[PDB]
Amino acid sequence: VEFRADSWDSDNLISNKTFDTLDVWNEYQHGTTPLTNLLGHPSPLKKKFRIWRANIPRAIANNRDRIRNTWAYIKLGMNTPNTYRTEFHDAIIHYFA
């Protein structure tokens, strides 16, 4: 899920915190990751050249299967307490057909 977004704090940009969860599910699958960003290690969420990119979760049942279906619901959200204005412009989803 490639997406552009920006969080502010009283005219100060915050290039580290945009979203805190990504629930992706369909009729037979459901996965979720916290969207953490560790600079050195791989993480669900990584930013580079001002674009965010999050690896879509994998099914809770197996923890190995990717979200494979003709369609799927994609849900971005923040669930950690915070007071920022978070402009969320759009989001591209990369799939393999």
Binding site: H41, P42, S43, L45, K46, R53, N55, N63, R64, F96
Partner: protein, 238 residues
């Protein structure tokens, strides 16, 4: 490179410079691809025709240092426990080491003296057994593989009137898997080659870059999903 370095540096190469731009591999998948990559690298750099330089095991200093930490010397154990049937009258069945990948030198210590073992093909055996004498040359012994159960059994056809007292085998040890995390922690009962825990690379650091690059290529091919890519990079599996 520790396993942690193999995982972190896979994402500087597979994942579009750690940008989460490419698909994203679990640690189990990275371990599987690294194990397959090291097997492929060993097989390709052993056979001279499998690599890009046309050079085999001992054809350059680099190749000598590549397999340096796999070469092992072990003794064969007489297979007198099982009274099987041998294809040759004077064949003493010997069992080889369990962690054996490729044999490169064999020697047998007889009462007459040490004799270098020649692994004789099925055509040369029929050719040399159609003659009057039907024995090896004075400084060599033959070897053919026989009925083997969950191991490697070899018939040592040494000249008659001689007894075998020893059998030394110099071979390439089977590499251990590359695992970047405790697989049982998040993946139920998945094993790479029977080990579920962190396993380092048992190879010289010189070919760690080769193995990582091959793993990255294998990952990119397996994810591009084209049949053409899969069959193209399947050529180098041998």
């Amino acid at each position: 490179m520790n396993v942690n370095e193999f995982s972190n540096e896979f994402d500087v190469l597979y994942n579009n410079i750690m940008s989460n731009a490419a698909p994203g591999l679990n640690e189990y998948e990275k371990s599987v691809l690294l194990t397959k990559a090291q097997e492929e690298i060993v097989k390709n750099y052993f056979e001279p025709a499998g690599n890009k330089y046309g050079k085999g095991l001992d054809d350059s200093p680099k190749r000598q240092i590549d397999f340096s930490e796999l070469i092992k010397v072990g003794e064969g154990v007489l297979n007198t426990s099982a009274p099987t049937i041998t294809f040759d009258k004077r064949a003493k069945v010997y069992d080889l080491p369990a962690d054996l990948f490729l044999v490169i030198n064999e020697a047998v210590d007889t009462n007459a003296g040490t004799k270098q073992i020649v692994p004789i093909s099925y055509s040369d055996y029929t050719r040399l057994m159609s003659r009057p004498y039907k024995e090896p040359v004075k400084y060599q012994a033959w070897r053919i593989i026989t009925t083997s159960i969950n191991n490697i059994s070899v018939e040592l056809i040494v000249n008659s009137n001689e007894t075998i007292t020893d059998y030394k085998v110099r071979y390439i040890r089977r590499p251990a898997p590359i695992i970047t995390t405790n697989l049982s922690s998040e993946y139920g009962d998945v094993t790479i080659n029977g080990v579920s825990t962190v396993s380092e690379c048992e190879l010289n650091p010189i070919i760690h870059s080769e193995i990582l690059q091959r793993a990255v290529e294998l990952a990119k091919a397996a994810y591009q999903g084209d049949l053409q890519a899969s069959v193209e990079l399947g050529q180098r599996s041998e």
